[PDB]
Amino acid sequence: TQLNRALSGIAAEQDRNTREVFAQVKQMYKTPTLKYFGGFNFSQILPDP
Amino acid sequence: LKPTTFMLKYDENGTITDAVDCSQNPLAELKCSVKSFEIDKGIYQTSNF
Ligand SMILES: *[C@@H]1O[C@H](CO)[C@@H](O[C@@H]2O[C@H](CO)[C@@H](O)[C@H](O)[C@H]2NC(C)=O)[C@H](O)[C@H]1NC(C)=O
Ligand SMILES: *[C@@H]1O[C@H](CO)[C@@H](O[C@@H]2O[C@H](CO)[C@@H](O)[C@H](O)[C@H]2NC(C)=O)[C@H](O)[C@H]1NC(C)=O
Protein backbone atom coordinates (compact mmCIF):
# COMPACT_ATOMS: atom_id res chain seq x y z
CA THR A 1 0.00 0.00 0.00
CA GLN A 2 2.75 2.44 0.99
CA LEU A 3 4.55 1.73 -2.28
CA ASN A 4 1.50 2.15 -4.51
CA ARG A 5 0.51 5.35 -2.69
CA ALA A 6 4.08 6.64 -2.92
CA LEU A 7 4.47 6.11 -6.66
CA SER A 8 1.03 7.48 -7.52
CA GLY A 9 1.75 10.62 -5.52
CA ILE A 10 5.08 11.11 -7.28
CA ALA A 11 3.34 10.46 -10.59
CA ALA A 12 0.38 12.77 -9.94
CA GLU A 13 2.61 15.76 -9.19
CA GLN A 14 4.15 15.39 -12.64
CA ASP A 15 0.81 16.39 -14.12
CA ARG A 16 0.66 19.27 -11.65
CA ASN A 17 4.10 20.50 -12.76
CA THR A 18 3.09 20.46 -16.42
CA ARG A 19 -0.10 22.48 -15.95
CA GLU A 20 1.72 24.94 -13.67
CA VAL A 21 4.10 25.84 -16.47
CA PHE A 22 2.15 25.58 -19.72
CA ALA A 23 -1.46 26.19 -18.66
CA GLN A 24 -1.28 29.93 -18.05
CA VAL A 25 -3.60 30.63 -21.00
CA LYS A 26 -7.26 31.42 -20.44
CA GLN A 27 -8.41 31.30 -24.08
CA MET A 28 -7.12 29.49 -27.15
CA TYR A 29 -6.43 32.03 -29.88
CA LYS A 30 -6.24 31.40 -33.59
CA THR A 31 -3.15 31.54 -35.77
CA PRO A 32 -3.18 34.76 -37.83
CA THR A 33 -2.48 34.56 -41.54
CA LEU A 34 -0.15 37.59 -41.57
CA LYS A 35 3.21 36.54 -40.18
CA TYR A 36 5.44 39.30 -41.61
CA PHE A 37 4.47 41.82 -38.94
CA GLY A 38 6.27 44.93 -40.12
CA GLY A 39 8.87 42.72 -41.75
CA PHE A 40 9.33 40.59 -38.62
CA ASN A 41 9.07 37.05 -40.00
CA PHE A 42 7.28 34.83 -37.45
CA SER A 43 6.83 31.64 -39.47
CA GLN A 44 9.41 29.64 -37.51
CA ILE A 45 8.04 30.19 -34.02
CA LEU A 46 4.39 29.62 -34.97
CA PRO A 47 2.99 26.18 -35.80
CA ASP A 48 2.73 25.24 -39.46
CA PRO A 49 -0.97 24.60 -40.19
CA LEU B 1 -21.29 -18.05 6.36
CA LYS B 2 -18.53 -17.10 3.96
CA PRO B 3 -14.91 -16.02 4.55
CA THR B 4 -15.37 -12.40 3.49
CA THR B 5 -14.08 -9.14 4.93
CA PHE B 6 -16.30 -6.53 6.58
CA MET B 7 -15.60 -3.08 7.91
CA LEU B 8 -17.40 -2.29 11.16
CA LYS B 9 -18.25 1.08 12.68
CA TYR B 10 -18.33 1.20 16.46
CA ASP B 11 -20.12 3.92 18.40
CA GLU B 12 -19.09 5.57 21.67
CA ASN B 13 -20.14 2.43 23.60
CA GLY B 14 -18.86 -0.31 21.32
CA THR B 15 -22.12 -1.08 19.52
CA ILE B 16 -21.71 -2.21 15.93
CA THR B 17 -23.96 0.34 14.25
CA ASP B 18 -23.01 -0.04 10.60
CA ALA B 19 -21.12 -2.40 8.33
CA VAL B 20 -19.85 -2.63 4.75
CA ASP B 21 -19.32 -5.86 2.80
CA CYS B 22 -15.95 -5.36 1.11
CA SER B 23 -16.76 -7.80 -1.71
CA GLN B 24 -20.23 -6.54 -2.62
CA ASN B 25 -19.48 -4.05 -5.41
CA PRO B 26 -16.53 -1.79 -6.40
CA LEU B 27 -18.03 1.07 -4.38
CA ALA B 28 -17.92 -0.94 -1.17
CA GLU B 29 -14.43 -2.15 -2.00
CA LEU B 30 -13.37 1.50 -1.98
CA LYS B 31 -14.94 2.35 1.39
CA CYS B 32 -13.08 -0.54 3.00
CA SER B 33 -9.84 0.77 1.50
CA VAL B 34 -9.92 4.40 2.60
CA LYS B 35 -11.68 3.73 5.97
CA SER B 36 -14.67 5.98 5.41
CA PHE B 37 -18.41 5.81 4.82
CA GLU B 38 -18.34 9.06 2.83
CA ILE B 39 -15.89 9.56 -0.03
CA ASP B 40 -15.25 12.75 -2.01
CA LYS B 41 -15.39 13.10 -5.80
CA GLY B 42 -12.33 12.01 -7.74
CA ILE B 43 -10.16 9.00 -8.55
CA TYR B 44 -8.92 6.87 -5.68
CA GLN B 45 -6.50 3.98 -5.82
CA THR B 46 -7.83 0.51 -5.07
CA SER B 47 -6.57 -3.08 -5.39
CA ASN B 48 -4.94 -4.33 -8.57
CA PHE B 49 -6.61 -6.91 -10.79
C1 LIG C 1 9.93 33.84 -43.68
O1 LIG C 1 10.54 32.59 -43.41
C2 LIG C 1 9.98 31.50 -44.15
C3 LIG C 1 10.65 30.24 -43.67
O2 LIG C 1 10.20 29.88 -42.37
C4 LIG C 1 10.14 31.74 -45.66
O3 LIG C 1 9.40 30.74 -46.35
C5 LIG C 1 10.19 30.02 -47.30
O4 LIG C 1 10.28 30.69 -48.58
C6 LIG C 1 11.04 29.98 -49.58
C7 LIG C 1 11.05 30.85 -50.81
O5 LIG C 1 9.97 30.53 -51.67
C8 LIG C 1 10.42 28.61 -49.83
O6 LIG C 1 11.22 27.89 -50.76
C9 LIG C 1 10.30 27.83 -48.52
O7 LIG C 1 9.61 26.61 -48.75
C10 LIG C 1 9.54 28.65 -47.48
N1 LIG C 1 9.46 27.94 -46.22
C11 LIG C 1 8.37 27.27 -45.83
C12 LIG C 1 8.46 26.59 -44.50
O8 LIG C 1 7.36 27.22 -46.52
C13 LIG C 1 9.59 33.11 -46.04
O9 LIG C 1 9.90 33.39 -47.40
C14 LIG C 1 10.16 34.20 -45.14
N2 LIG C 1 9.56 35.49 -45.46
C15 LIG C 1 10.08 36.33 -46.36
C16 LIG C 1 9.34 37.62 -46.56
O10 LIG C 1 11.10 36.06 -46.98
C1 LIG D 1 -23.30 5.39 25.65
O1 LIG D 1 -23.95 5.00 26.86
C2 LIG D 1 -24.27 6.10 27.73
C3 LIG D 1 -24.83 5.50 29.00
O2 LIG D 1 -23.82 5.37 30.00
C4 LIG D 1 -25.23 7.05 27.02
O3 LIG D 1 -25.49 8.16 27.87
C5 LIG D 1 -26.91 8.37 28.00
O4 LIG D 1 -27.52 8.72 26.75
C6 LIG D 1 -28.94 8.93 26.81
C7 LIG D 1 -29.40 9.20 25.40
O5 LIG D 1 -28.32 9.09 24.48
C8 LIG D 1 -29.24 10.09 27.76
O6 LIG D 1 -30.64 10.25 27.88
C9 LIG D 1 -28.62 9.82 29.13
O7 LIG D 1 -28.80 10.95 29.97
C10 LIG D 1 -27.14 9.50 29.01
N1 LIG D 1 -26.58 9.15 30.31
C11 LIG D 1 -25.47 9.72 30.80
C12 LIG D 1 -25.04 9.25 32.15
O8 LIG D 1 -24.85 10.58 30.18
C13 LIG D 1 -24.62 7.51 25.71
O9 LIG D 1 -25.55 8.30 24.98
C14 LIG D 1 -24.20 6.32 24.85
N2 LIG D 1 -23.55 6.76 23.64
C15 LIG D 1 -24.19 6.90 22.47
C16 LIG D 1 -23.36 7.37 21.32
O10 LIG D 1 -25.39 6.65 22.36
From Swiss-Prot, chain A:
It comes from the Viruses. Glycans are attached at residue 41. Changing residue 1 to A: In strain: Isolate SZ3. It comes from Severe acute respiratory syndrome coronavirus. This is Spike protein S2. Mediates fusion of the virion and cellular membranes by acting as a class I viral fusion protein. Under the current model, the protein has at least three conformational states: pre-fusion native state, pre-hairpin intermediate state, and post-fusion hairpin state. During viral and target cell membrane fusion, the coiled coil regions (heptad repeats) assume a trimer-of-hairpins structure, positioning the fusion peptide in close proximity to the C-terminal region of the ectodomain. Changing residue 36 to D: In strain: Isolate GD01, Isolate GZ50, Isolate GD03 and Isolate SZ3.
